[PDB]
């Protein structure tokens, strides 16, 4: 930013620690998350084959306590890294998975006013809904949220009912092997994209701060920097 906002460690600790404490308070649901994952002790020796960057409540607290975050979205990212690790490693029917989901529900209810007190639009990391996908074999056809579909290379998509590829009428089409696709479900949420305030440098969501009737020819400036 031009007049950059610098967060001092105590500012971040005092603002964000209540949201971490809200997770700690959940009993039984925080219990799997209060300490670093110890695969030999827990009997899950394949853990680090699947989880490459572990995260837990005690580590996040230590990072807040020692000023290891420069800005609060780094804290939000660590909280969701912790959650996403657990949703990846554990089965949907498992205790740890269900406890993770409770913690995420608590976090999402706590984080917005805290991030707003630090000058941000909100604290919400992910978009509200999966994006609607375009379906290749009809013109009209689209893949709604949570629908099943097939996909090659994350790009050419087909709804399973109508399941020779090209992305432009002038592009020579190629024959791809049906049985080289991957069946998927359209239930993934992407991170909400950001725009930086050109004065203070805070990352704000495009959807929160950019409006259909406003132009920013010299660059976005947030409400507090105006
Ligand atoms: C996050 C971490 C690692 C993980 O992804 N999966 C996992 C698998 C097996 C046990 C635990 C585990 C670790 C510590 C405590 C714990 O407690 C479970 C429990 C049992 C009974 C009451 C309350 C909590 C489970 C666990 N969790
Ligand atoms: Na899983
Ligand atoms: Zn926002
Ligand atoms: Zn279709
Ligand atoms: Zn600003």
Short mmCIF file of N, CA, C and O in Angstrom, two decimals, residues 128-217:
data_model
loop_
_atom_site.label_atom_id
_atom_site.label_comp_id
_atom_site.label_asym_id
_atom_site.label_seq_id
_atom_site.Cartn_x
_atom_site.Cartn_y
_atom_site.Cartn_z
N UNK A 128 -19.65 -18.51 -1.11
CA UNK A 128 -20.82 -19.11 -0.48
C UNK A 128 -21.25 -20.41 -1.15
O UNK A 128 -21.78 -21.29 -0.47
N UNK A 129 -21.03 -20.54 -2.45
CA UNK A 129 -21.56 -21.67 -3.20
C UNK A 129 -20.56 -22.11 -4.25
O UNK A 129 -19.75 -21.29 -4.72
N UNK A 130 -20.58 -23.38 -4.64
CA UNK A 130 -19.75 -23.81 -5.78
C UNK A 130 -20.19 -23.05 -7.02
O UNK A 130 -21.35 -22.68 -7.16
N UNK A 131 -19.24 -22.79 -7.91
CA UNK A 131 -19.59 -22.09 -9.14
C UNK A 131 -20.28 -23.05 -10.09
O UNK A 131 -19.94 -24.24 -10.17
N UNK A 132 -21.31 -22.54 -10.78
CA UNK A 132 -21.99 -23.31 -11.80
C UNK A 132 -21.02 -23.61 -12.94
O UNK A 132 -20.29 -22.73 -13.40
N UNK A 133 -21.01 -24.86 -13.38
CA UNK A 133 -20.09 -25.29 -14.41
C UNK A 133 -20.80 -25.42 -15.75
O UNK A 133 -21.99 -25.73 -15.82
N UNK A 134 -20.06 -25.18 -16.82
CA UNK A 134 -20.60 -25.31 -18.16
C UNK A 134 -20.44 -26.74 -18.65
O UNK A 134 -19.37 -27.34 -18.48
N UNK A 135 -21.49 -27.26 -19.25
CA UNK A 135 -21.58 -28.63 -19.71
C UNK A 135 -21.39 -28.69 -21.21
O UNK A 135 -22.10 -28.00 -21.94
N UNK A 136 -20.47 -29.57 -21.66
CA UNK A 136 -19.92 -29.49 -23.02
C UNK A 136 -20.84 -30.00 -24.12
O UNK A 136 -20.69 -29.54 -25.25
N UNK A 137 -21.75 -30.93 -23.85
CA UNK A 137 -22.41 -31.66 -24.93
C UNK A 137 -23.73 -31.04 -25.37
O UNK A 137 -24.24 -31.36 -26.45
N UNK A 138 -24.30 -30.17 -24.55
CA UNK A 138 -25.34 -29.28 -25.05
C UNK A 138 -24.84 -27.85 -24.88
O UNK A 138 -23.86 -27.58 -24.17
N UNK A 139 -25.48 -26.95 -25.60
CA UNK A 139 -25.16 -25.53 -25.51
C UNK A 139 -25.77 -24.93 -24.24
O UNK A 139 -25.07 -24.28 -23.45
N UNK A 140 -27.05 -25.18 -24.04
CA UNK A 140 -27.82 -24.77 -22.88
C UNK A 140 -27.26 -25.29 -21.56
O UNK A 140 -27.45 -24.63 -20.53
N UNK A 141 -26.59 -26.44 -21.56
CA UNK A 141 -26.48 -27.28 -20.38
C UNK A 141 -25.44 -26.75 -19.40
O UNK A 141 -24.33 -26.38 -19.79
N UNK A 142 -25.80 -26.74 -18.11
CA UNK A 142 -24.90 -26.32 -17.05
C UNK A 142 -25.01 -27.29 -15.88
O UNK A 142 -26.04 -27.95 -15.69
N UNK A 143 -23.94 -27.37 -15.10
CA UNK A 143 -23.84 -28.29 -13.96
C UNK A 143 -24.06 -27.48 -12.69
O UNK A 143 -23.20 -26.64 -12.35
N UNK A 144 -25.15 -27.68 -11.96
CA UNK A 144 -25.42 -26.87 -10.76
C UNK A 144 -24.55 -27.33 -9.60
O UNK A 144 -23.75 -28.26 -9.70
N UNK A 145 -24.72 -26.65 -8.47
CA UNK A 145 -23.99 -27.02 -7.27
C UNK A 145 -24.41 -28.41 -6.81
O UNK A 145 -25.57 -28.82 -6.98
N UNK A 146 -23.46 -29.16 -6.26
CA UNK A 146 -23.62 -30.49 -5.69
C UNK A 146 -23.97 -31.55 -6.72
O UNK A 146 -24.17 -32.71 -6.35
N UNK A 147 -24.04 -31.21 -8.00
CA UNK A 147 -24.36 -32.19 -9.03
C UNK A 147 -23.13 -33.03 -9.36
O UNK A 147 -21.99 -32.59 -9.24
N UNK A 148 -23.39 -34.27 -9.78
CA UNK A 148 -22.32 -35.15 -10.24
C UNK A 148 -21.99 -34.87 -11.70
O UNK A 148 -22.86 -34.48 -12.49
N UNK A 149 -20.73 -35.08 -12.06
CA UNK A 149 -20.27 -34.78 -13.41
C UNK A 149 -18.91 -35.45 -13.63
O UNK A 149 -18.29 -35.95 -12.68
N UNK A 150 -18.48 -35.48 -14.88
CA UNK A 150 -17.18 -36.01 -15.28
C UNK A 150 -16.29 -34.87 -15.77
O UNK A 150 -16.78 -33.89 -16.35
N UNK A 151 -14.99 -35.01 -15.57
CA UNK A 151 -14.09 -33.91 -15.90
C UNK A 151 -12.73 -34.44 -16.34
O UNK A 151 -12.15 -35.32 -15.69
N UNK A 152 -12.23 -33.88 -17.44
CA UNK A 152 -10.88 -34.09 -17.92
C UNK A 152 -10.06 -32.85 -17.62
O UNK A 152 -10.47 -31.74 -17.97
N UNK A 153 -8.91 -33.03 -16.95
CA UNK A 153 -7.94 -31.96 -16.81
C UNK A 153 -8.50 -30.75 -16.05
O UNK A 153 -7.97 -29.63 -16.17
N UNK A 154 -9.55 -30.95 -15.27
CA UNK A 154 -10.22 -29.89 -14.51
C UNK A 154 -10.92 -28.88 -15.41
O UNK A 154 -11.13 -27.73 -15.00
N UNK A 155 -11.28 -29.24 -16.64
CA UNK A 155 -11.64 -28.19 -17.58
C UNK A 155 -12.83 -28.53 -18.45
O UNK A 155 -13.82 -27.78 -18.50
N UNK A 156 -12.73 -29.61 -19.21
CA UNK A 156 -13.84 -30.07 -20.03
C UNK A 156 -14.75 -30.89 -19.14
O UNK A 156 -14.36 -31.94 -18.63
N UNK A 157 -15.96 -30.38 -18.93
CA UNK A 157 -16.88 -30.97 -17.98
C UNK A 157 -18.11 -31.47 -18.68
O UNK A 157 -18.57 -30.88 -19.67
N UNK A 158 -18.66 -32.54 -18.14
CA UNK A 158 -19.92 -33.03 -18.63
C UNK A 158 -20.79 -33.54 -17.49
O UNK A 158 -20.35 -34.38 -16.70
N UNK A 159 -22.03 -33.05 -17.45
CA UNK A 159 -23.07 -33.69 -16.65
C UNK A 159 -23.24 -35.14 -17.08
O UNK A 159 -23.11 -35.49 -18.26
N UNK A 160 -23.52 -36.00 -16.10
CA UNK A 160 -23.46 -37.44 -16.29
C UNK A 160 -24.53 -37.96 -17.25
O UNK A 160 -24.33 -39.02 -17.84
N UNK A 161 -25.64 -37.25 -17.44
CA UNK A 161 -26.67 -37.72 -18.37
C UNK A 161 -26.19 -37.73 -19.82
O UNK A 161 -26.38 -38.73 -20.53
N UNK A 162 -25.60 -36.63 -20.29
CA UNK A 162 -25.20 -36.60 -21.69
C UNK A 162 -23.80 -37.22 -21.88
O UNK A 162 -23.31 -37.41 -23.01
N UNK A 163 -23.08 -37.45 -20.77
CA UNK A 163 -21.85 -38.26 -20.79
C UNK A 163 -22.20 -39.69 -21.15
O UNK A 163 -23.39 -40.04 -21.22
N UNK A 164 -13.88 -35.78 -28.45
CA UNK A 164 -14.50 -34.81 -29.35
C UNK A 164 -14.55 -33.41 -28.73
O UNK A 164 -15.58 -32.74 -28.77
N UNK A 165 -13.42 -32.96 -28.18
CA UNK A 165 -13.38 -31.78 -27.33
C UNK A 165 -12.73 -30.60 -28.04
O UNK A 165 -11.74 -30.76 -28.76
N UNK A 166 -13.30 -29.42 -27.82
CA UNK A 166 -12.70 -28.16 -28.23
C UNK A 166 -13.35 -27.03 -27.49
O UNK A 166 -14.51 -27.13 -27.07
N UNK A 167 -12.61 -25.93 -27.31
CA UNK A 167 -13.13 -24.80 -26.54
C UNK A 167 -13.40 -23.57 -27.40
O UNK A 167 -13.67 -22.49 -26.85
N UNK A 168 -13.36 -23.70 -28.73
CA UNK A 168 -13.64 -22.57 -29.61
C UNK A 168 -13.97 -23.13 -30.99
O UNK A 168 -13.36 -24.13 -31.39
N UNK A 169 -14.93 -22.55 -31.72
CA UNK A 169 -15.29 -23.11 -33.03
C UNK A 169 -14.13 -23.21 -34.01
O UNK A 169 -14.17 -24.06 -34.92
N UNK A 170 -13.10 -22.39 -33.86
CA UNK A 170 -11.96 -22.44 -34.76
C UNK A 170 -10.85 -23.35 -34.26
O UNK A 170 -9.86 -23.53 -34.98
N UNK A 171 -10.98 -23.93 -33.06
CA UNK A 171 -9.92 -24.75 -32.49
C UNK A 171 -10.06 -26.18 -32.97
O UNK A 171 -11.11 -26.80 -32.73
N UNK A 172 -9.06 -26.74 -33.65
CA UNK A 172 -9.18 -28.13 -34.11
C UNK A 172 -9.46 -29.05 -32.93
O UNK A 172 -8.73 -29.06 -31.95
N UNK A 173 -10.56 -29.78 -33.03
CA UNK A 173 -10.96 -30.61 -31.90
C UNK A 173 -10.08 -31.85 -31.82
O UNK A 173 -9.50 -32.30 -32.80
N UNK A 174 -9.96 -32.39 -30.61
CA UNK A 174 -9.17 -33.58 -30.37
C UNK A 174 -10.06 -34.65 -29.77
O UNK A 174 -11.04 -34.36 -29.08
N UNK A 175 -9.74 -35.91 -30.07
CA UNK A 175 -10.45 -37.04 -29.50
C UNK A 175 -9.75 -37.43 -28.20
O UNK A 175 -8.58 -37.84 -28.22
N UNK A 176 -10.45 -37.29 -27.09
CA UNK A 176 -9.95 -37.71 -25.79
C UNK A 176 -10.69 -38.97 -25.39
O UNK A 176 -11.89 -39.12 -25.67
N UNK A 177 -9.98 -39.87 -24.73
CA UNK A 177 -10.49 -41.19 -24.42
C UNK A 177 -11.54 -41.08 -23.31
O UNK A 177 -11.22 -40.75 -22.17
N UNK A 178 -12.80 -41.31 -23.67
CA UNK A 178 -13.83 -41.57 -22.67
C UNK A 178 -13.45 -42.80 -21.85
O UNK A 178 -13.50 -43.92 -22.38
N UNK A 179 -13.13 -42.57 -20.57
CA UNK A 179 -12.45 -43.47 -19.63
C UNK A 179 -11.10 -42.88 -19.22
O UNK A 179 -10.29 -43.55 -18.57
N UNK A 180 -10.84 -41.65 -19.65
CA UNK A 180 -9.74 -40.83 -19.15
C UNK A 180 -10.24 -39.68 -18.29
O UNK A 180 -9.43 -38.91 -17.77
N UNK A 181 -11.55 -39.57 -18.14
CA UNK A 181 -12.16 -38.57 -17.28
C UNK A 181 -12.19 -39.05 -15.84
O UNK A 181 -11.90 -40.21 -15.52
N UNK A 182 -12.56 -38.14 -14.95
CA UNK A 182 -12.70 -38.44 -13.53
C UNK A 182 -14.08 -38.00 -13.08
O UNK A 182 -14.47 -36.85 -13.30
N UNK A 183 -14.83 -38.92 -12.48
CA UNK A 183 -16.12 -38.57 -11.91
C UNK A 183 -15.92 -37.72 -10.66
O UNK A 183 -15.04 -38.00 -9.84
N UNK A 184 -16.72 -36.67 -10.54
CA UNK A 184 -16.57 -35.70 -9.46
C UNK A 184 -17.95 -35.22 -9.02
O UNK A 184 -18.97 -35.55 -9.62
N UNK A 185 -17.96 -34.43 -7.95
CA UNK A 185 -19.15 -33.77 -7.45
C UNK A 185 -18.87 -32.28 -7.37
O UNK A 185 -17.76 -31.87 -7.01
N UNK A 186 -19.85 -31.46 -7.74
CA UNK A 186 -19.65 -30.02 -7.83
C UNK A 186 -19.96 -29.36 -6.49
O UNK A 186 -20.89 -28.56 -6.35
N UNK A 187 -19.16 -29.71 -5.49
CA UNK A 187 -19.42 -29.25 -4.12
C UNK A 187 -18.21 -28.55 -3.50
O UNK A 187 -18.15 -28.40 -2.28
N UNK A 188 -17.24 -28.13 -4.31
CA UNK A 188 -16.06 -27.43 -3.82
C UNK A 188 -16.30 -25.93 -3.77
O UNK A 188 -16.86 -25.34 -4.70
N UNK A 189 -15.87 -25.30 -2.68
CA UNK A 189 -15.93 -23.85 -2.54
C UNK A 189 -14.54 -23.27 -2.76
O UNK A 189 -13.57 -23.72 -2.14
N UNK A 190 -14.43 -22.26 -3.68
CA UNK A 190 -13.18 -21.57 -3.94
C UNK A 190 -13.01 -20.40 -2.96
O UNK A 190 -14.00 -19.84 -2.49
N UNK A 191 -11.78 -20.00 -2.65
CA UNK A 191 -11.59 -18.79 -1.83
C UNK A 191 -12.21 -17.58 -2.51
O UNK A 191 -12.15 -17.43 -3.73
N UNK A 192 -12.83 -16.71 -1.70
CA UNK A 192 -13.40 -15.45 -2.18
C UNK A 192 -12.26 -14.54 -2.65
O UNK A 192 -11.35 -14.26 -1.85
N UNK A 193 -12.25 -14.06 -3.89
CA UNK A 193 -11.08 -13.31 -4.38
C UNK A 193 -10.98 -11.92 -3.78
O UNK A 193 -11.97 -11.29 -3.39
N UNK A 194 -9.73 -11.43 -3.72
CA UNK A 194 -9.41 -10.19 -3.03
C UNK A 194 -9.08 -9.05 -4.00
O UNK A 194 -8.69 -9.27 -5.15
N UNK A 195 -9.21 -7.84 -3.48
CA UNK A 195 -8.63 -6.63 -4.05
C UNK A 195 -7.96 -5.87 -2.92
O UNK A 195 -8.50 -5.79 -1.81
N UNK A 196 -6.75 -5.35 -3.16
CA UNK A 196 -6.03 -4.66 -2.10
C UNK A 196 -6.36 -3.17 -2.10
O UNK A 196 -6.45 -2.55 -3.16
N UNK A 197 -6.55 -2.61 -0.91
CA UNK A 197 -6.63 -1.16 -0.81
C UNK A 197 -5.29 -0.54 -1.20
O UNK A 197 -4.24 -0.94 -0.68
N UNK A 198 -5.33 0.42 -2.12
CA UNK A 198 -4.06 0.95 -2.60
C UNK A 198 -3.40 1.85 -1.57
O UNK A 198 -2.19 2.11 -1.70
N UNK A 199 -4.13 2.29 -0.55
CA UNK A 199 -3.52 3.09 0.53
C UNK A 199 -2.98 2.20 1.65
O UNK A 199 -1.77 2.14 1.87
N UNK A 200 -3.87 1.52 2.38
CA UNK A 200 -3.44 0.77 3.56
C UNK A 200 -2.96 -0.64 3.24
O UNK A 200 -2.32 -1.27 4.10
N UNK A 201 -3.23 -1.15 2.04
CA UNK A 201 -2.76 -2.46 1.66
C UNK A 201 -3.58 -3.63 2.18
O UNK A 201 -3.22 -4.78 1.88
N UNK A 202 -4.65 -3.38 2.93
CA UNK A 202 -5.48 -4.49 3.39
C UNK A 202 -6.12 -5.23 2.22
O UNK A 202 -6.60 -4.61 1.27
N UNK A 203 -6.16 -6.56 2.33
CA UNK A 203 -6.85 -7.40 1.35
C UNK A 203 -8.34 -7.43 1.69
O UNK A 203 -8.71 -7.89 2.78
N UNK A 204 -9.18 -6.95 0.77
CA UNK A 204 -10.63 -6.93 0.93
C UNK A 204 -11.25 -7.81 -0.13
O UNK A 204 -10.70 -7.96 -1.22
N UNK A 205 -12.42 -8.40 0.15
CA UNK A 205 -13.07 -9.19 -0.89
C UNK A 205 -13.66 -8.30 -1.97
O UNK A 205 -14.37 -7.34 -1.67
N UNK A 206 -13.42 -8.67 -3.23
CA UNK A 206 -14.06 -7.98 -4.35
C UNK A 206 -15.58 -7.90 -4.17
O UNK A 206 -16.18 -6.84 -4.35
N UNK A 207 -16.20 -9.01 -3.76
CA UNK A 207 -17.65 -9.04 -3.64
C UNK A 207 -18.15 -8.17 -2.49
O UNK A 207 -19.28 -7.68 -2.53
N UNK A 208 -17.31 -7.93 -1.48
CA UNK A 208 -17.71 -7.11 -0.33
C UNK A 208 -17.57 -5.62 -0.60
O UNK A 208 -18.33 -4.83 -0.03
N UNK A 209 -16.61 -5.20 -1.42
CA UNK A 209 -16.24 -3.79 -1.49
C UNK A 209 -16.38 -3.18 -2.88
O UNK A 209 -16.30 -1.94 -3.00
N UNK A 210 -16.54 -3.97 -3.93
CA UNK A 210 -16.68 -3.46 -5.29
C UNK A 210 -18.13 -3.60 -5.71
O UNK A 210 -18.68 -4.71 -5.68
N UNK A 211 -18.74 -2.50 -6.12
CA UNK A 211 -20.17 -2.46 -6.38
C UNK A 211 -20.46 -2.11 -7.83
O UNK A 211 -19.67 -1.43 -8.49
N UNK A 212 -21.62 -2.59 -8.31
CA UNK A 212 -21.97 -2.54 -9.72
C UNK A 212 -22.04 -1.12 -10.25
O UNK A 212 -21.96 -0.94 -11.47
N UNK A 213 -22.22 -0.12 -9.38
CA UNK A 213 -22.41 1.26 -9.83
C UNK A 213 -21.22 2.16 -9.53
O UNK A 213 -21.35 3.38 -9.63
N UNK A 214 -20.07 1.60 -9.15
CA UNK A 214 -18.91 2.38 -8.75
C UNK A 214 -17.71 1.98 -9.61
O UNK A 214 -17.46 0.79 -9.80
N UNK A 215 -16.97 2.99 -10.12
CA UNK A 215 -15.73 2.80 -10.88
C UNK A 215 -14.56 3.26 -10.02
O UNK A 215 -14.66 4.24 -9.28
N UNK A 216 -13.42 2.56 -10.16
CA UNK A 216 -12.18 2.90 -9.47
C UNK A 216 -11.04 3.07 -10.47
O UNK A 216 -10.11 2.26 -10.50
N UNK A 217 -11.05 4.15 -11.26
CA UNK A 217 -10.02 4.29 -12.30
C UNK A 217 -8.61 4.40 -11.74
O UNK A 217 -7.67 3.91 -12.38
#
